[PDB]
Amino acid sequence: MIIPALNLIGGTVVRVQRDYGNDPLPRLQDYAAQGAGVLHLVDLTGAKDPAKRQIPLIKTLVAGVNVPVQVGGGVRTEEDVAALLKAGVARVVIGSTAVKSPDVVKGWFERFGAQALVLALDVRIDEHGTKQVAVSGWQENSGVSLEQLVETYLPVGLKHVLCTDISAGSNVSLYEEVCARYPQIAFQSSGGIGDIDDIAALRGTGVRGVIVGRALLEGKFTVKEAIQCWQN
Ligand SMILES: NC(=O)c1ncn([C@@H]2O[C@H](COP(=O)(O)O)[C@@H](O)[C@H]2O)c1/N=C/N[C@@H]1O[C@H](COP(=O)(O)O)[C@@H](O)[C@H]1O
């Protein structure tokens, strides 16, 4: 599936910065109108300040579409997850916290269920060829590999994993490897999509979701054409 994405800062759509206007709902509705089944939102305001979590806006955007929306952005506490889900969010995307407190997040899986949580992994292939997990782009590796963290959450029923290469299209070999090793996990690719050929390159990798952000905002292609290429 194609997963259109938007980055939000105080109700503003931004390139990750560059402004794209403060009217995200018509964009999302048109995305869904072209056949999109899932949408993706990153709350950068809430990621910076937890008390600034754009819950009312998210609640409006969710109510404005007919498709499940997965939302992430500095999700730190069990209360953050509950608040987002209560706002109508389908799945909560968790990156940093899932790396720093695995035992706590594993408790979240037990309470909320694996259908409501998405494990986001920022991955850098280091000097040794290890798929290192990082909490952000401006910080060093954490000393934990993708395999270690994935197999840590498998006992609590891990299903959805968002994998971003932060070390030009998407890293095809990367996704081919991880999707084959963990066939019981629906992997989502993220970052790298520059044109329509980048989507075609991921068709046989085994990924179940392709997240596209910029390419849509810059008119490289439409969601419709993306889905057409994806379904071949
Ligand atoms: N400062 C940030 O930019 C940031 N901070 C966190 N995230 C993501 O949020 C999620 C949760 O992060 P935490 O706040 O829990 O650590 C993870 O997936 C992170 O990668 C961030 N990523 C934002 N942009 C995303 O990166 C990808 C780029 O795609 P492209 O346009 O097609 O090229 C898309 O998925 C975009 O939505």
Experimental method: X-ray
Question: Could you tell me the CATH number of the domain that includes residue 23?
Answer: 3.20.20.70
- The finding on whether 212 has its CB within 6 A of some atom of ligand 1 is yes
Q: In angstroms, what is the span from residue 59 Cα to ligand 1's centroid?
A: 20
∠ CA 190-194-195, rounded to 5°: 115
- The finding on whether 7 has its CB within 6 A of some atom of ligand 1 is yes
What residue's CA is closest to ligand 1, atom 14?
Answer: 74
* 201 contacts 170 by C-beta, under 8 angstroms: yes
Task: Compute the distance between CA of residue 60 and CA of residue 55 in angstroms, rounded to an integer.
Answer: 9
88: Cα within 13 Å, side-chain hemisphere: 18
- If one counts the domains in the chain, the total is 1
**Resolution, expressed in angstroms to one decimal:** 2.3
- The finding on whether 120 has its CB within 6 A of some atom of ligand 1 is yes
Q: In angstroms, what is the span from residue 10 Cα to ligand 1's centroid?
A: 16
CA proximity to 146, closest of 163, 134, 161, 133:
133
What residue's CA is closest to ligand 1, atom 37?
Answer: 5
What residue's CA is closest to ligand 1, atom 26?
Answer: 191
The string of DSSP letters for the chain reads -EEEEEEESSS-BEE--EE--S-HHHHHHHHHHTT---EEEEEHHHHH-GGG--HHHHHHHHHT-SS-EEEESS--SHHHHHHHHHTT-SEEEE-HHHHH-HHHHHHHHHHH-GGGEEEEEEEEE-TTS-EEEESSTTS---S-BHHHHHHHHGGGT--EEEEEE------HHHHHHHHHH-TTSEEEEES---SHHHHHTTTTT--SEEEE-HHHHTTS--HHHHHHHHH-
* 158 contacts 114 by C-beta, under 8 angstroms: yes
Residue partners of 219: CB distance under 8 A and separation at least 6: none
What residue's CA is closest to ligand 1, atom 12?
Answer: 95
User: Which amino acid would we find at residue 85?
Assistant: L
Q: Is 43 exposed, middle or buried (0-12, 13-18, 19+ CB in 10 A)?
A: buried
Residues spanned by the domain of 53: 1-232
- The 8 Å CB, 24+ separation contacts for 49-56 are 50/74, 50/76, 50/77, 50/80, 53/80, 53/83, 53/84, 54/8, 54/10, 54/11, 55/83, 55/84, 55/87
User: Which amino acid would we find at residue 117?
Assistant: L
